[PDB]
Design a protein around this ligand. Structure first.
Ligand SMILES: CC(=O)SCCNC(=O)CCNC(=O)[C@H](O)C(C)(C)COP(=O)(O)OP(=O)(O)OC[C@H]1O[C@@H](n2cnc3c(N)ncnc32)[C@H](O)[C@@H]1OP(=O)(O)O
Ligand SMILES: [Mg+2]
Length: 327
Protein backbone atom coordinates (compact mmCIF):
# COMPACT_ATOMS: atom_id res chain seq x y z
CA UNK A 1 0.00 0.00 0.00
CA UNK A 2 1.51 3.23 1.31
CA UNK A 3 4.68 1.75 2.79
CA UNK A 4 8.15 3.28 2.69
CA UNK A 5 10.92 1.74 0.62
CA UNK A 6 14.71 1.81 0.27
CA UNK A 7 16.10 3.94 -2.55
CA UNK A 8 19.50 2.36 -2.87
CA UNK A 9 20.95 -0.92 -4.05
CA UNK A 10 18.99 -4.07 -3.31
CA UNK A 11 20.77 -7.11 -1.87
CA UNK A 12 18.60 -9.27 -4.12
CA UNK A 13 20.11 -7.66 -7.20
CA UNK A 14 23.69 -7.72 -5.92
CA UNK A 15 23.36 -11.36 -4.85
CA UNK A 16 22.35 -12.27 -8.41
CA UNK A 17 25.88 -11.50 -9.57
CA UNK A 18 28.12 -14.54 -9.61
CA UNK A 19 30.94 -12.86 -7.75
CA UNK A 20 28.67 -12.46 -4.65
CA UNK A 21 26.75 -15.69 -4.80
CA UNK A 22 27.18 -17.62 -1.56
CA UNK A 23 28.83 -14.72 0.28
CA UNK A 24 27.86 -14.03 3.92
CA UNK A 25 24.54 -12.19 4.01
CA UNK A 26 25.77 -9.47 6.33
CA UNK A 27 28.51 -8.62 3.86
CA UNK A 28 25.97 -8.00 1.13
CA UNK A 29 23.72 -5.92 3.45
CA UNK A 30 26.69 -3.63 4.09
CA UNK A 31 27.64 -3.52 0.41
CA UNK A 32 24.07 -2.83 -0.71
CA UNK A 33 24.12 0.18 1.60
CA UNK A 34 27.30 1.40 -0.09
CA UNK A 35 26.70 1.25 -3.85
CA UNK A 36 24.23 2.83 -6.24
CA UNK A 37 22.23 1.38 -9.15
CA UNK A 38 23.24 2.46 -12.67
CA UNK A 39 21.19 2.06 -15.85
CA UNK A 40 22.63 3.33 -19.12
CA UNK A 41 21.43 3.41 -22.71
CA UNK A 42 23.79 2.46 -25.53
CA UNK A 43 26.34 4.97 -26.80
CA UNK A 44 26.36 6.76 -23.45
CA UNK A 45 29.53 8.13 -21.86
CA UNK A 46 29.80 6.86 -18.30
CA UNK A 47 33.31 7.99 -17.42
CA UNK A 48 35.54 10.56 -19.07
CA UNK A 49 39.31 10.44 -19.37
CA UNK A 50 41.11 13.04 -17.28
CA UNK A 51 38.20 13.63 -14.89
CA UNK A 52 38.36 13.09 -11.11
CA UNK A 53 37.97 9.41 -10.43
CA UNK A 54 35.34 9.49 -7.77
CA UNK A 55 33.79 6.09 -8.37
CA UNK A 56 34.20 2.62 -9.87
CA UNK A 57 31.63 0.79 -11.96
CA UNK A 58 30.71 -2.88 -11.57
CA UNK A 59 28.94 -4.14 -14.67
CA UNK A 60 25.96 -6.47 -14.19
CA UNK A 61 24.92 -6.49 -17.89
CA UNK A 62 26.01 -4.91 -21.17
CA UNK A 63 29.50 -3.81 -22.24
CA UNK A 64 31.60 -0.73 -22.91
CA UNK A 65 34.53 0.64 -24.86
CA UNK A 66 37.44 1.74 -22.67
CA UNK A 67 39.53 4.23 -24.67
CA UNK A 68 42.69 5.97 -23.50
CA UNK A 69 43.90 8.74 -25.80
CA UNK A 70 47.57 9.64 -25.49
CA UNK A 71 48.93 13.17 -25.83
CA UNK A 72 50.17 11.91 -29.20
CA UNK A 73 46.56 11.25 -30.13
CA UNK A 74 47.13 7.50 -30.31
CA UNK A 75 44.06 5.75 -28.91
CA UNK A 76 44.51 2.63 -26.84
CA UNK A 77 41.30 0.67 -26.58
CA UNK A 78 40.03 -2.16 -24.39
CA UNK A 79 36.57 -3.58 -23.65
CA UNK A 80 34.65 -3.89 -20.37
CA UNK A 81 32.36 -6.89 -20.03
CA UNK A 82 29.62 -8.04 -17.63
CA UNK A 83 31.06 -8.84 -14.20
CA UNK A 84 34.01 -6.54 -14.87
CA UNK A 85 35.14 -3.63 -12.69
CA UNK A 86 35.87 -0.33 -14.46
CA UNK A 87 37.77 2.72 -13.19
CA UNK A 88 38.93 1.33 -9.87
CA UNK A 89 42.68 1.83 -10.23
CA UNK A 90 42.51 5.59 -10.77
CA UNK A 91 39.93 5.68 -7.97
CA UNK A 92 42.30 3.91 -5.58
CA UNK A 93 45.34 5.96 -6.67
CA UNK A 94 43.29 9.22 -6.63
CA UNK A 95 44.53 10.03 -10.11
CA UNK A 96 42.66 11.40 -13.11
CA UNK A 97 40.58 8.83 -14.96
CA UNK A 98 42.77 6.93 -17.41
CA UNK A 99 40.20 6.39 -20.15
CA UNK A 100 36.79 7.41 -21.50
CA UNK A 101 34.24 4.67 -20.95
CA UNK A 102 31.34 4.54 -23.42
CA UNK A 103 28.63 1.88 -23.46
CA UNK A 104 28.55 -0.25 -26.68
CA UNK A 105 25.03 -1.45 -25.85
CA UNK A 106 22.50 -1.09 -23.03
CA UNK A 107 24.27 -1.40 -19.70
CA UNK A 108 23.43 -1.95 -16.01
CA UNK A 109 25.58 -2.20 -12.88
CA UNK A 110 26.51 -0.34 -9.68
CA UNK A 111 28.69 2.58 -8.84
CA UNK A 112 30.47 3.26 -5.59
CA UNK A 113 33.32 5.17 -3.98
CA UNK A 114 36.58 4.09 -2.41
CA UNK A 115 34.84 2.99 0.80
CA UNK A 116 32.39 0.89 -1.16
CA UNK A 117 35.28 -0.74 -3.01
CA UNK A 118 37.00 -1.49 0.32
CA UNK A 119 33.78 -2.95 1.72
CA UNK A 120 33.37 -5.05 -1.38
CA UNK A 121 36.86 -6.56 -1.42
CA UNK A 122 36.61 -7.34 2.30
CA UNK A 123 33.71 -9.76 1.76
CA UNK A 124 35.13 -13.29 2.10
CA UNK A 125 35.93 -14.80 -1.33
CA UNK A 126 35.28 -11.59 -3.27
CA UNK A 127 38.70 -10.01 -3.43
CA UNK A 128 40.20 -13.16 -4.94
CA UNK A 129 37.43 -13.34 -7.52
CA UNK A 130 37.77 -9.73 -8.44
CA UNK A 131 41.54 -10.19 -8.87
CA UNK A 132 40.81 -13.04 -11.30
CA UNK A 133 38.51 -10.68 -13.19
CA UNK A 134 41.25 -8.01 -13.22
CA UNK A 135 43.57 -10.66 -14.63
CA UNK A 136 41.05 -11.48 -17.36
CA UNK A 137 40.63 -7.80 -18.13
CA UNK A 138 44.33 -7.52 -18.93
CA UNK A 139 44.81 -10.87 -20.59
CA UNK A 140 41.96 -10.15 -22.98
CA UNK A 141 43.92 -7.45 -24.82
CA UNK A 142 47.58 -7.79 -23.83
CA UNK A 143 49.46 -10.51 -25.71
CA UNK A 144 53.01 -11.77 -25.20
CA UNK A 145 55.71 -10.73 -27.65
CA UNK A 146 57.68 -13.60 -29.22
CA UNK A 147 61.42 -12.99 -29.08
CA UNK A 148 64.40 -14.98 -30.19
CA UNK A 149 67.83 -14.88 -28.55
CA UNK A 150 71.11 -14.83 -30.49
CA UNK A 151 71.60 -18.57 -29.69
CA UNK A 152 68.19 -19.24 -31.25
CA UNK A 153 66.24 -19.59 -28.00
CA UNK A 154 62.55 -18.86 -28.55
CA UNK A 155 60.87 -16.99 -25.68
CA UNK A 156 57.90 -14.79 -24.90
CA UNK A 157 57.98 -11.41 -23.17
CA UNK A 158 54.89 -10.31 -21.28
CA UNK A 159 53.99 -8.19 -18.29
CA UNK A 160 53.28 -10.06 -15.10
CA UNK A 161 49.54 -10.74 -14.89
CA UNK A 162 47.43 -10.12 -11.79
CA UNK A 163 47.83 -13.04 -9.42
CA UNK A 164 51.21 -14.18 -10.89
CA UNK A 165 53.89 -15.12 -8.32
CA UNK A 166 56.51 -12.93 -10.02
CA UNK A 167 54.59 -9.99 -8.59
CA UNK A 168 55.31 -10.95 -4.97
CA UNK A 169 58.52 -12.93 -5.20
CA UNK A 170 61.39 -10.52 -5.34
CA UNK A 171 64.28 -10.72 -2.97
CA UNK A 172 66.54 -7.97 -4.34
CA UNK A 173 64.62 -4.76 -3.58
CA UNK A 174 63.32 -3.88 -0.15
CA UNK A 175 59.65 -3.01 -0.54
CA UNK A 176 56.22 -4.64 -0.27
CA UNK A 177 52.56 -4.00 -1.06
CA UNK A 178 52.01 -2.15 2.20
CA UNK A 179 55.07 0.06 1.93
CA UNK A 180 54.59 0.88 -1.72
CA UNK A 181 50.84 1.63 -1.53
CA UNK A 182 50.43 2.94 2.02
CA UNK A 183 50.40 6.48 0.65
CA UNK A 184 47.10 5.72 -1.12
CA UNK A 185 45.31 4.57 2.01
CA UNK A 186 43.40 -2.62 4.94
CA UNK A 187 45.21 -5.76 3.73
CA UNK A 188 42.63 -6.87 1.12
CA UNK A 189 42.57 -3.49 -0.57
CA UNK A 190 46.38 -3.12 -0.59
CA UNK A 191 46.77 -6.61 -2.00
CA UNK A 192 44.31 -5.90 -4.78
CA UNK A 193 45.97 -2.63 -5.73
CA UNK A 194 49.43 -4.19 -5.71
CA UNK A 195 48.34 -6.93 -8.04
CA UNK A 196 46.74 -4.57 -10.56
CA UNK A 197 49.31 -1.79 -10.44
CA UNK A 198 51.60 -1.07 -13.38
CA UNK A 199 52.41 2.50 -12.39
CA UNK A 200 54.68 2.17 -9.34
CA UNK A 201 55.81 -1.41 -9.74
CA UNK A 202 56.24 -2.73 -13.24
CA UNK A 203 57.26 -6.32 -13.86
CA UNK A 204 58.23 -8.05 -17.13
CA UNK A 205 58.28 -11.83 -17.26
CA UNK A 206 59.98 -14.01 -19.86
CA UNK A 207 58.70 -17.48 -20.52
CA UNK A 208 59.90 -20.58 -22.38
CA UNK A 209 57.06 -22.94 -23.23
CA UNK A 210 54.84 -20.96 -20.83
CA UNK A 211 57.25 -21.44 -17.89
CA UNK A 212 58.88 -18.30 -16.41
CA UNK A 213 62.61 -18.14 -17.05
CA UNK A 214 63.35 -14.59 -16.00
CA UNK A 215 61.78 -11.43 -14.70
CA UNK A 216 62.76 -7.81 -14.29
CA UNK A 217 61.06 -4.93 -12.63
CA UNK A 218 61.29 -1.32 -11.55
CA UNK A 219 59.93 0.05 -8.31
CA UNK A 220 59.14 3.76 -8.26
CA UNK A 221 60.84 5.80 -5.55
CA UNK A 222 58.41 7.34 -3.08
CA UNK A 223 60.48 10.52 -2.66
CA UNK A 224 61.38 11.13 -6.33
CA UNK A 225 58.72 9.78 -8.74
CA UNK A 226 61.10 10.13 -11.72
CA UNK A 227 63.44 7.53 -10.20
CA UNK A 228 62.93 3.78 -9.87
CA UNK A 229 65.06 0.96 -8.52
CA UNK A 230 65.54 -1.98 -10.86
CA UNK A 231 66.04 -5.70 -10.43
CA UNK A 232 66.54 -8.74 -12.69
CA UNK A 233 66.52 -12.49 -12.23
CA UNK A 234 67.25 -15.12 -14.87
CA UNK A 235 66.96 -18.84 -14.19
CA UNK A 236 70.41 -20.45 -13.91
CA UNK A 237 70.21 -22.58 -17.05
CA UNK A 238 69.14 -19.48 -19.03
CA UNK A 239 71.87 -17.12 -17.91
CA UNK A 240 74.47 -15.64 -20.24
CA UNK A 241 72.22 -15.73 -23.27
CA UNK A 242 71.46 -12.02 -23.40
CA UNK A 243 68.17 -12.09 -21.51
CA UNK A 244 69.31 -9.60 -18.86
CA UNK A 245 70.68 -7.30 -21.59
CA UNK A 246 67.30 -7.56 -23.35
CA UNK A 247 65.26 -6.96 -20.19
CA UNK A 248 66.94 -3.70 -19.22
CA UNK A 249 65.94 -2.52 -22.68
CA UNK A 250 62.34 -3.72 -22.22
CA UNK A 251 62.29 -2.17 -18.77
CA UNK A 252 63.50 1.17 -20.22
CA UNK A 253 60.68 1.20 -22.77
CA UNK A 254 58.14 0.61 -20.00
CA UNK A 255 59.78 3.21 -17.77
CA UNK A 256 59.45 5.90 -20.45
CA UNK A 257 55.72 5.18 -20.69
CA UNK A 258 55.57 5.36 -16.88
CA UNK A 259 57.43 8.68 -16.67
CA UNK A 260 60.48 7.14 -14.99
CA UNK A 261 63.57 9.14 -16.00
CA UNK A 262 66.31 7.39 -14.02
CA UNK A 263 67.11 3.89 -12.74
CA UNK A 264 68.91 3.09 -9.45
CA UNK A 265 70.71 -0.26 -9.19
CA UNK A 266 72.56 -2.02 -6.36
CA UNK A 267 74.46 -5.33 -6.52
CA UNK A 268 77.54 -7.06 -5.16
CA UNK A 269 80.73 -5.66 -6.64
CA UNK A 270 81.54 -9.09 -8.06
CA UNK A 271 78.36 -9.58 -10.06
CA UNK A 272 80.04 -9.33 -13.42
CA UNK A 273 77.11 -9.80 -15.78
CA UNK A 274 74.97 -7.26 -13.89
CA UNK A 275 77.79 -4.70 -13.70
CA UNK A 276 78.47 -5.21 -17.39
CA UNK A 277 74.83 -4.62 -18.24
CA UNK A 278 74.91 -1.30 -16.37
CA UNK A 279 78.30 -0.41 -17.82
CA UNK A 280 76.69 -0.29 -21.28
CA UNK A 281 74.47 2.52 -20.02
CA UNK A 282 77.26 4.72 -18.65
CA UNK A 283 77.16 3.56 -15.05
CA UNK A 284 79.31 5.40 -12.56
CA UNK A 285 79.86 3.13 -9.58
CA UNK A 286 79.72 4.26 -5.96
CA UNK A 287 81.04 1.94 -3.28
CA UNK A 288 79.04 1.04 -0.19
CA UNK A 289 79.71 -1.30 2.72
CA UNK A 290 79.69 -5.11 2.72
CA UNK A 291 80.77 -5.63 -0.89
CA UNK A 292 77.96 -3.59 -2.41
CA UNK A 293 78.14 -1.13 -5.28
CA UNK A 294 75.43 1.21 -6.52
CA UNK A 295 74.78 3.38 -9.53
CA UNK A 296 72.21 5.65 -11.11
CA UNK A 297 71.65 5.85 -14.88
CA UNK A 298 69.36 7.81 -17.15
CA UNK A 299 66.68 5.73 -18.75
CA UNK A 300 67.89 5.53 -22.38
CA UNK A 301 65.74 7.59 -24.75
CA UNK A 302 64.27 6.51 -28.09
CA UNK A 303 66.97 5.42 -30.53
CA UNK A 304 69.38 4.93 -27.64
CA UNK A 305 68.54 1.30 -26.91
CA UNK A 306 70.38 -1.42 -28.85
CA UNK A 307 67.02 -3.10 -29.54
CA UNK A 308 65.61 -2.92 -33.05
CA UNK A 309 63.02 -0.27 -33.84
CA UNK A 310 60.38 -2.95 -34.46
CA UNK A 311 61.14 -4.61 -31.12
CA UNK A 312 60.88 -1.27 -29.34
CA UNK A 313 57.52 -0.50 -30.96
CA UNK A 314 56.09 -3.90 -29.94
CA UNK A 315 57.26 -3.47 -26.33
CA UNK A 316 55.98 0.13 -26.25
CA UNK A 317 52.54 -1.03 -27.45
CA UNK A 318 52.25 -3.53 -24.63
CA UNK A 319 53.58 -1.13 -22.03
CA UNK A 320 50.98 1.44 -23.02
CA UNK A 321 48.26 -1.20 -22.90
CA UNK A 322 49.00 -2.28 -19.37
CA UNK A 323 49.82 1.15 -17.95
CA UNK A 324 47.40 3.46 -19.79
CA UNK A 325 44.22 1.72 -20.83
CA UNK A 326 42.99 -0.81 -18.28
CA UNK A 327 41.00 0.51 -14.01
C1 LIG B 1 70.30 -4.73 -10.09
C2 LIG B 1 70.18 -6.18 -9.92
O1 LIG B 1 69.14 -6.77 -10.23
S1 LIG B 1 71.39 -7.12 -9.04
C3 LIG B 1 70.73 -8.76 -9.03
C4 LIG B 1 70.89 -9.49 -10.36
N1 LIG B 1 70.43 -10.83 -10.31
C5 LIG B 1 71.28 -11.86 -9.87
O2 LIG B 1 72.44 -11.66 -9.57
C6 LIG B 1 70.69 -13.29 -9.84
C7 LIG B 1 71.49 -14.29 -10.65
N2 LIG B 1 71.98 -13.80 -11.96
C8 LIG B 1 70.98 -13.42 -12.93
O3 LIG B 1 69.82 -13.50 -12.68
C9 LIG B 1 71.52 -12.92 -14.30
O4 LIG B 1 72.70 -13.56 -14.59
C10 LIG B 1 71.77 -11.40 -14.39
C11 LIG B 1 70.42 -10.68 -14.24
C12 LIG B 1 72.80 -10.87 -13.39
C13 LIG B 1 72.35 -11.18 -15.85
O5 LIG B 1 71.52 -11.62 -16.86
P1 LIG B 1 72.05 -12.52 -17.98
O6 LIG B 1 70.94 -12.81 -18.97
O7 LIG B 1 72.72 -13.72 -17.36
O8 LIG B 1 73.20 -11.70 -18.65
P2 LIG B 1 73.45 -11.38 -20.18
O9 LIG B 1 73.61 -12.71 -20.88
O10 LIG B 1 72.53 -10.30 -20.70
O11 LIG B 1 74.94 -10.77 -20.12
C14 LIG B 1 75.21 -9.49 -19.64
C15 LIG B 1 76.57 -9.03 -20.00
O12 LIG B 1 77.51 -9.69 -19.10
C16 LIG B 1 78.47 -10.34 -19.91
N3 LIG B 1 79.01 -11.54 -19.28
C17 LIG B 1 78.30 -12.59 -18.85
N4 LIG B 1 79.17 -13.46 -18.31
C18 LIG B 1 80.43 -12.99 -18.44
C19 LIG B 1 81.69 -13.48 -18.08
N5 LIG B 1 81.82 -14.82 -17.43
N6 LIG B 1 82.79 -12.72 -18.31
C20 LIG B 1 82.68 -11.52 -18.91
N7 LIG B 1 81.48 -11.02 -19.26
C21 LIG B 1 80.34 -11.74 -19.04
C22 LIG B 1 77.75 -10.62 -21.20
O13 LIG B 1 78.67 -10.81 -22.21
C23 LIG B 1 76.99 -9.37 -21.39
O14 LIG B 1 77.86 -8.37 -21.84
P3 LIG B 1 77.69 -7.63 -23.23
O15 LIG B 1 77.05 -6.30 -23.06
O16 LIG B 1 79.09 -7.51 -23.74
O17 LIG B 1 76.85 -8.43 -24.16
MG1 LIG C 1 61.20 -23.69 -25.60
Amino acid sequence: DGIAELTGARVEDLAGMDVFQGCPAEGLVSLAASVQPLRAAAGQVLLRQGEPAVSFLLISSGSAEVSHVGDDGVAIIARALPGMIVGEIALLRDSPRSATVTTIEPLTGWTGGRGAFATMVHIPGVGERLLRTARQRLAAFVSPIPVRLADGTQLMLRPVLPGDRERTVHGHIQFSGETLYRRFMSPALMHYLSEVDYVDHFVWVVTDGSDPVADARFVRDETDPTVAEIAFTVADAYQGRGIGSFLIGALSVAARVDGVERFAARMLSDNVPMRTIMDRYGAVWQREDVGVITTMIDVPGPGELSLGREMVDQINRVARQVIEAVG
